[PDB]
Amino acid sequence: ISPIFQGGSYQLNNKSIDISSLLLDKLSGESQTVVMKFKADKPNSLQALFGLSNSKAGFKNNYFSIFMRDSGEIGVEIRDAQKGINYLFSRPASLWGKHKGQAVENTLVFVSDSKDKTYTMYVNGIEVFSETVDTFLPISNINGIDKATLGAVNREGKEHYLAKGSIDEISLFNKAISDQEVSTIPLSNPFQLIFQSGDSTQANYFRIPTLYTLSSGRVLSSIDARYGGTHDSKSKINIATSYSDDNGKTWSEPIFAMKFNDYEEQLVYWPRDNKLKNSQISGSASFIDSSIVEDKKSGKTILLADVMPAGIGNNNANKADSGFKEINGHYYLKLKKNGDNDFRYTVRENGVVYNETTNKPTNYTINDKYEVLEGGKSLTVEQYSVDFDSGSLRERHNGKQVPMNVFYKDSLFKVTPTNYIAMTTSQNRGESWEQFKLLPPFLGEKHNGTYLCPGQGLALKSSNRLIFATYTSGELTYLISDDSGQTWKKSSASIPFKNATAEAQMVELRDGVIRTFFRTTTGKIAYMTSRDSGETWSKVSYIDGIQQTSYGTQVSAIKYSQLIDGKEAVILSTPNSRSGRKGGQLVVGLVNKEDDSIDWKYHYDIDLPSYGYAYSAITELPNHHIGVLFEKYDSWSRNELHLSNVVQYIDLEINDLT
Template sequence: MRKILCIVLCVLLAVGVLVAGLGFVITPKSAKAPNDPVEGVKPFSASSELSCNYYRIPALWTTQSGTVLAAIDARYGGTHDSPNNIDAAVSRSFDAGQSWESPRLVAGFRDWANDGMLLKSNGSYTVADSASVIDPALLEDTTTGRIFLLMDAFPANAGAPASEVGTGYTQIDGQPALLLRKAGETEFSYTLREDGAIYDEAGAKTEYTVNARGEILENGQPLFLAQRRQKYWFNVPYVVETGEQVPMHIFYDGALFSALGTSYLYLLYSDDDGKTWSEPVELNAQVKPENVGFFGVSPGRGVQLTTGAHKGRLLFTAYALDAETGEQQFAALFSDDGGKTWQSGEFVTLTDEIRSMSETQLVECPDGSLLAFSRTTSGYMSVSRSTNGGESWSAPTLDDALPLSAGSGCQVSALRINRKLDGKDVVLLSAPAGEGRKNGFLYVGVLEADEAGTYGVDWKYKKELTDADTYFAYSCLTELPDGNIGLLYEQTNIAQSVDTVVFCSYTFSELCETPLD
């Protein structure tokens, strides 16, 4: 009997070791959601046609036509970051956020099936072998009406801490060429060039090409991979094939040619108010520094300058992570030709007091200068300034009027609205002030210039959005067509929480009821 028991234990151990190498951790198939869904309007819900239980990282924008556009991560593999099975979803509202159309996916990958399974809250439950997109930011060019959606993209097994140093490109005859590694080889000796063909290390064109979606073709015929699905035997996860063959992408595990395992930047656009979207354009060759591993989007919103020397400039922010030190610094990404080409500015300089400035949101001042509000690990938000359209930044300072959850901090949302208070332009900011991303506040301030003409914010009011015991994590603000303020936020910080991304709206007078102490 003892011998039989030992054999059974050895078999179970072997199965555990086997599945551990498949990119999974142990998760009960019938796990119960770790939360009760919160009340409120939900543009993205587990009950939608997307069959996704987990959503994170909201972005929000009101278009010139009055449509309220929301974007978010559809995290099929659980709420954790990349590497994971994550796609990008959008939804629209035509009545100032009271109701929303059915959400739809606009970017993502098909290497793993998008199954709506429930996972336990404890542990890091991800599909690590999946390619992913993550962290959306929205921006509209008011001249053309084109809406941009920027996000990170990762090959299988890559994420923020696990991003190899480099852009993933080399230069050939002055033009960027994507580096590729052929299956079974160790070096990235192949290149994808402007004509869409893959060239070998001798510079000879091969029979392989890559289309605009990143899919590999041989002699003009698409190559395929078997799509995979996560299943369970009791509490032990294992992998099966779905029976569907999906186009082979250079980001997929098992592809004939694969890209460098680092962070990439995907830019999509819509010319019909967010109804349909372009294929993604990859921006690393234009904006990512060669000596950086992770270089990712600050989720939320971008800005377009309306005055000054750089009027019309489009800006997002991105940040770099030093995986060894944990230090993070942001830089602006900007375009002066309507989003056709992009450049990156200088990184903000860290100080002894501020060793991390990651996810950052921008506000334009009346003179065209910029204020940057950044997530830090110092217990307060930081503020830095640019007088050259985001090309460089002043030394940052902490704003003691803007407490931020201690520890790793949290993303913030900042917005200048089309309203005056005491004759001055109004800025709004939302973020959690309490421990563990609880106790969310929305702050109201006015833009004021000092004697030297340098703008800052005088914070006047605050509104408590969630109490000290209620979560308030990532958020995004927008000014609604009716003049109210819209807010899309995560009312949780617990892994694998279901239906906790909520849309709310407030009148301006509601936000100005409590003066800032």
Template structure:
């Protein structure tokens, strides 16, 4: 295994804390790495969290200067907006990189998101001073009439900001699923597109990406489909979290949300009211099987401390009841999973914190039987290990972008050959 190098930290960026690695490889071998740049603390939102990117054209040996793909606003932890938890996806048919993430206004995190999409009458709901407005086409409307109050793309208006609550006006206090894209391998990025109106149900509170990666289906009936894992909450506390995917058949123009996997212990099964924590499904990653079927590897809160795996035969629209993978221990933490080839055969590679007690012992594992067992492994580190993202590089090695410190002061990159897994 190659000696790890630091890709994100204070020496390259603007903050002291970096989290949530995401890595993608384009058809010409360009690596695009993304992370949360966290300004006032290493913690999740509420916090100011930007999306930052670095690029490598030599299989991760050297990296470009840091690029800010999404810049948020704010002066302190409680009065800042956040763009949290990236997932990158490469569309090889259009040579486009997509980034999915969750945006929240000041003071909002996974534990206190209000219910709803945040949209009404074709615009974003804004409240302040006991009044309700609709932000549409850069202007606030009240009762269908323009107010003359202009709001720019960063949320600024004269005297305040609707994302940081400065000035007294605030967008609906929930989480927003956002999508941006790059046509030049990560150098520049589009303006964010709101996905809540089409994907978030009115009864959802939190919604977010399954951080690390999405995929493009390469075989079968759904060839070309883009698939991102997500998860969402049906309440505040307890949050009632569950997983799903979103998918697009028109290269990201429109998206559809698939069903959540059925799981025993929820009642009623289709629209659960009773939903014990042991049935929660959260951050997940999706891989494609040779048939075009999908496997979803899910973080969960079951005391068994094994990753759940579910299968879809319809491109992510529906899923089988999840089963535990005995070879994939976890400590209620994110897992990376990618499809690859080993000795001419289909394989699945996973990377995660393999302890059942705490976030430590980063291990890569290889399956040669479509995810049933993972007999081959390589320990990346015996020490602290948290989130990761892996890809097969142009030179045939595995590249892993990962967190190996719970202080979250940097994100590292290493490479190894699949032959090193024993």
């Protein structure tokens, strides 16, 4: 159907615009849709874009509004004091402000559906909330409504929630348009989605993006596909990948690089209320924090990620146990059998499960997928599914049998409850992945594994050397391979931090010279340098001119292929803020070839200083553009948990940055 009202080119300059005459007598029936294309690149702290109110004395709480905050939050209020209704629905981190320094046209669609008693908001083609109520309040059924307003709400004759921005286009319909019809509304998005709710992963949430440009020109991305809300492990999380063959313009349907099947892959709307938002899938194995590198010699792609057995994360991982036993100068994975109080088994050569108490081998073996076989026969466990049907999280058997894996809660044989690092490879540039293998311990039997630094590994340009950074208490632990990742050694680099999440990413400044940039607890990004391809490392220095919070955020970095202002250039991606994960920037640094110091010369604002920006991935695309895949929200804030479609991708050119 066509609109009952349509208007545009409204400038909101801290002065409301009255459209009562045009709109109020057009409103009819109990269902409505608002479609609004608007810009706000310098919003007030809290502002209303659109309002329908009773402006009379004594009815200040009788109004409908669409409002936004300078945090990027969008929402509505639907209020009628006589009816005793005060609805407030909203979602943080739903908006764009600026892109390439120009104000972004956001497309907002609000559907008020009396038949289904549901209010649904979309912004930029993304559903940010859908709320069903027992007692529906039609937006123009508010008692005594007498004003329709742009850029404020008229309460008792005065302008509340005054806005700064513009509404280029606004249409209203006397119908609740379908989700199908919404999908046909043209958008002006500055961004793309690679991974998204409803795709092949069936994860409703994503975190920890990576990007890496392959020698063929294919661009590969990996990510945490997070099922139980956006929580770090313990949860259910798989590692998923997607690639682009056209410089980032389009992306393949995701596949899994690493996955467990003890729990179903379920698209769940995780509760965001204060009572339930910390609900956590507590019995599932999971992966977390992936990193990618390409090996020139073999041509293989290599992906590592942390691995957690059922119920396990950072919080509860057995520190002081690697989960391996040394026997002869070799490391074997330890196992505990159903009913034992200790770990009396090891996985020796050829997956053979071996009893340590009696040095006797068993009739159990572990196959390549870490699955348990008895006498060559595949053992199984029943899968779990999760739901909130009861008002709290339940994890229960779903009737389906899956291969028994030693990382599972229901397995006859279990690994040590600690964190491991797994490796997989692809021989077809991400079209499929091999079954993962655990990496051996690097810091000894009685040390839990290090934590992988998410993002990219480093393939030195002049050799076959591959490096993945990892971190642990007191050091960075670089993992080095010269044989296509068949064998690894460590190179330890002391840092003056205990228990830091020292997520580190590397650039090769020139042949053999590596600078690593890393997250700290000091509010500054740190760096160190190797001049011998990672064998030894300098002391730690800090970057001035960029601020992070006390807790820090992952930083991504690349060495750009082209000179800028006649100099070798490095580009860093990070929030720039001492307050929260917001104020995203790409910072272009020029290398002083006299001493390899870096002059951080250009700061490019990804979006508003107040809009969210957390973990990120950057890559130089084959056409010399820059691709950025990043968490567009504050992934620390306890107010912005469990948001869908906030990991987003943009394309930039160097002239945009400088």
